[PDB]
Amino acid sequence: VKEFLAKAKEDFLKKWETPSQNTAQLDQFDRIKTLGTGSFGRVMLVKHKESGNHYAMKILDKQKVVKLKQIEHTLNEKRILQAVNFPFLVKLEFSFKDNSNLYMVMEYVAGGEMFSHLRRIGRFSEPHARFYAAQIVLTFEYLHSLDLIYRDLKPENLLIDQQGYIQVTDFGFAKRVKGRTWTLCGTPEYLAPEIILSKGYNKAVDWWALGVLIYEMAAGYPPFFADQPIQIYEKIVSGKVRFPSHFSSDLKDLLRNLLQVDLTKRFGNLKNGVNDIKNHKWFATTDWIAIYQRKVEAPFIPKFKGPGDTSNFDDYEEEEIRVSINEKCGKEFTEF
């Protein structure tokens, strides 16, 4: 892996250092329907006029971004996503801005969020959860080797593609950092205790969040839940975790090592790095290269009926995409 990652870093750094800009414009697409939303962004299925291809267009209102103090995070999101390349990371096809909004146009991943399948089916069997987990382990090995921390792992940000494999989306909190950082950001159920306790933290928070993800996939509910975030933070900080009766002993052992409040003990954070996870008994049946190569049979393949089908996505209320005749926040977003 060390040879592959070295070359991967060279490729990434060229793009990190000279990012792509302004590679499309709004009137090149017809907007069709909203696919999903987050706290201040909307992603729409669109059709590109000259190619006929569909894409997923993330639209951010620049004034909302500034009001919520997310300028730096948004510049991070686009600078990093345009620079990465890995089989389980969604591809950014175009980006541009206009007087009012920022646009990130990705490949459309039609199989829907992992979230919706997970809630509907209830939970995933351990082989099913393990197939998805292995892809995240490989993706975090890749991202961390570029000095990137991802910081927002959750089923709502994981899309299932037409072959049943994962595409990670939402680089909103991704950040290139050597050593520690302090921003309180993420999703409450997925936050590592060191984030909540404000002491400064590093890429080990992504391995914690992997533990949450695996738990939630295999249990059908998170290891720490409640009706309000403060109550969740209390449970995370207690760190007490209880497991469903049906979890295997191997899964329980892995999760105690990922949901480890002690950073000198947390898997992914030790001397052997990601190999403590890759070599754990729960992953004994996983062929790590075949996963990378996408040669493993997926446990589940969402129905797909045609270019532009959105039936694997919930419906959303639509709103006008307004573009003012006055430029908003031009200086702030110059490099976008």
């Binding site: 919520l68 979230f115 309180l184 950001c185």
Partner: peptide
């Protein structure tokens, strides 16, 4: 059951990010 307690709670739908 833990399942029943989760399903009756108010955080079973899509979760938004926080960023403070």
């Amino acid at each position: 059951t833990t399942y029943a307690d989760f399903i009756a709670s108010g955080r079973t739908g899509r979760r938004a990010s926080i960023h403070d």
